[PDB]
């Protein structure tokens, strides 16, 4: 039993400084300092787990509301399918060749609408929800909140009329506290939207930077779909489309850090994690770690090919985690992302507008500072 090794920082806020200068770089660095190292954020110490084996142990160990399970299981997503198809193909018209797409603005919107319309059905939260959620997300980076609370309440009050078959979360949430619901709703929809949105931005970036897969995706879709606009059933066949998304998520994951708190004194990789300790780890660094991945920084959707897939460590690619603090929408996420990607790559070809700033901006989630793309007519 040995305590973790310290890294290298300054006076009042040791690692706090190297951390703020370049979060992403700091996290990828930690990796070599050892499987687990101790870093000081100002006065308090935190533990950093940088190994795929210990990070899995970290998420699967409970030492760090099934209500929600019935709305996100694989069985409740085939029912959301229509709204997913609907929202996707609607983007396909909404965007037209020649006009640049404002990724931040447009990705955030598709995100809110898919989430809100599948997880809630009826009186539309159309642009109102989007805007409130917009003004808010920007407050974080560097009259909306009220509306958000206003609308969340008002919307709940309307399903109270007739919400018979609504297998959505809202009805799942109404059959388990008065304000607890309003909060468990506001709490689930908020992150999930910004999260899927940031992911969409990187997908748009992938389709413009790699026309080869963009089209390969169009080929795979046309085969399966014939010509009919892609549908849920189709998504379960579009393999390549799925690989592109994973590969894009691996190199640029919306959630790049994760935290845990030790309840009981623990042991990890032969190291002693003090009871009540604050621990941290970066899916970002794990997914881009040379010891886990062959072509470490090479966009390659085909590394997820059976043969090479098995070459990569067990928990080295876990955009969502394993234990209960996992992502309920893992199925619901990939399902809408797959649909939107296939719908977009089939109809279009993407190109980045000169002046586009696809540089990563580290905030709540990782996202491109100012990605500008233009859909070009494919066939």
317 binds ligand HEM (CB under 6 A): no
Q: Is 335 in the site for ligand HEM (CB under 6 A)?
A: no
CA distance 245 to 301: 8
* Binding site per annotation, positions for heme: 327
List 170, 254, 273, 344, residue binding ligand HEM (CB under 6 A)? 254
Sketch the per residue contact string, 99 through 118, with ligand HEM: x for CB under 6 A, - otherwise. ----------------x---
Question: Using CB under 6 A, which of 319, 341, 345, 368 touches ligand HEM?
Answer: 319
Under the binding rule (CB under 6 A), the answer on residue 195 touching ligand HEM is yes
Stretch that binds ligand HEM, among 87-95, 234-242, 267-275, 313-321 (CB under 6 A): 313-321
CB nearer ligand HEM, residue 195 or residue 205: 195
Does the protein bind ligand HEM through residue 17 (CB under 6 A)?
no
Q: Cα(first)–Cα(last) distance of the chain, in Å?
A: 64
The pairs formed by 302-307 with CB atoms below 8 angstroms and a separation of 24 or more are 302/243, 303/247, 304/243, 304/246, 304/247, 305/243
| Segment interacting with ligand HEM (CB under 6 A) among 33-41, 122-130, 139-147, 326-334 | 326-334
Least Å distance, CB 166 to ligand HEM, is 16
Shortest spacing between CB 319 and ligand HEM, in angstroms? 4
C-beta of 5 vs 364, nearer to ligand HEM: 364
Q: Which is nearer to ligand HEM, 156 or 258 (CB)?
A: 258
CB of 97 to ligand HEM, least distance (A): 27
Tell which one of 50, 292, 329, 338 touches ligand HEM (CB under 6 A). 329
Question: Of the two residues 260 and 374, which places its CB atom closer to ligand HEM in the complex?
Answer: 260
Among 169, 148, 167, 170, which residue's Cα sits nearest to residue 158? 170
Among 55, 282, 333, 346, binds ligand HEM (CB under 6 A): 333
Residue count at the site for ligand HEM (CB under 6 A)? 21
Q: How far apart are CA 137 and CA 153, in angstroms?
A: 20
State CA 119 to chain mean position distance. Answer: 17
Quote the tokens at residue 193: 């939207």
The site map against ligand HEM for 199-218 (x = CB under 6 A) is: x-------------------
Residue nearest to ligand HEM (CB): 192
- Residue 46 Cβ vs ligand HEM, minimum distance, rounded to whole Å: 15
d(CA 70, CA 331): 12
Contact 174, 158 (CB under 8 A): no
Q: Report how far residue 202's alpha carbon sits from residue 215's, in angstroms, rounded to the nearest whole number.
A: 17
Q: Burial level of 108, CB count in 10 A (0-12/13-18/19+)?
A: buried
Task: Kindly tell me which of 9 and 191 has the beta carbon lying closer to ligand HEM.
Answer: 191
- Beta-carbon contacts of 112 under 8 Å, excluding residues fewer than 6 positions away, are 125, 129, 130, 133, 189, 193, 197
Name residue 271's beta-bridge partners. Answer: 2, 268
Nearer to ligand HEM, 199 or 225 (CB): 199
Nearest approach, Cβ of 8 to ligand HEM (angstroms)?
27
Determine the Cα–Cα distance for residues 42 and 19; give it in Å rounded to an integer.
11
The values of phi and psi at residue 205, to 5°, are -65, -40
Distance from CA of residue 347 to its chain's centroid?
A: 25
55 touching ligand HEM, by CB under 6 A: no
User: 53, exposed or middle or buried, with CB in 10 Å at 0-12, 13-18, 19+?
Assistant: middle
List residues near ligand HEM by CB under 6 A.
59, 115, 188-189, 191-192, 195-196, 199, 254-255, 258, 319-321, 324-325, 327-329, 333
């Amino acid at each position: 039993r040995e305590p973790p090794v310290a890294g290298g920082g300054v006076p009042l806020l040791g690692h706090g400084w190297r951390l703020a200068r370049d979060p992403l770089a700091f996290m990828s660095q930690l990796r070599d300092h050892g499987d687990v190292v101790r870093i000081k954020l100002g006065p308090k110490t935190v533990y950093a787990v940088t190994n795929p084996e210990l990070t899995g142990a970290l998420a699967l160990n409970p030492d760090y509301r099934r209500t929600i399970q019935p709305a996100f299981r694989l069985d409740a997503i085939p029912a959301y399918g229509p709204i997913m198809e609907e929202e996707a193909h609607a983007l396909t018209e909404r965007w037209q060749p020649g006009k640049t797409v404002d990724a931040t603005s447009e990705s955030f919107r598709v995100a809110v609408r898919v989430a809100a319309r599948c997880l809630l059905r009826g009186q539309y939260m159309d642009e109102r929800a989007e805007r409130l959620c917009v003004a808010l997300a920007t407050v974080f980076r560097g009259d909306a909140l009220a509306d958000l609370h206003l609308l969340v309440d008002e919307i709940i009050a309307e399903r109270r009329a007739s919400g018979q078959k609504p297998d959505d979360l809202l009805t799942a949430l109404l059959e388990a506290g008065e304000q607890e619901i309003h909060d468990q709703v506001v709490a689930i929809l908020t992150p999930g939207s910004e999260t899927i949105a940031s992911t969409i931005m990187w997908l748009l970036q992938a389709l413009a930077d790699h026309p080869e897969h963009a089209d390969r995706i169009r080929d795979e879709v046309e085969a399966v779909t014939g010509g009919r606009p892609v549908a849920f059933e189709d998504v379960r066949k579009l393999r390549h489309t799925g690989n592109v998304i994973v590969e894009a998520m691996r190199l640029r994951p919306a959630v790049w850090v994760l935290t845990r708190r030790a309840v009981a004194e623990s042991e990890l990789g032969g190291y002693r994690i003090p009871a009540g300790a604050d621990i941290i780890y970066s899916p970002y660094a794990i997914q881009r770690d040379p010891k886990s991945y062959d072509d470490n920084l090479e966009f390659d959707p085909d590394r997820w090919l059976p043969e090479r897939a098995a070459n990569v460590p067990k928990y080295a690619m876990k955009p969502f985690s394993a234990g209960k603090r996992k992502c309920p929408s893992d199925h619901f996420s990939m399902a809408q992302l797959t649909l939107i990607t296939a719908a977009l790559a089939t109809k279009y070809r993407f190109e980045q507008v000169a002046g586009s700033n696809d540089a990563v901006r580290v905030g709540i989630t990782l996202r491109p500072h100012d990605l500008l793309v233009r859909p070009v007519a494919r066939h």
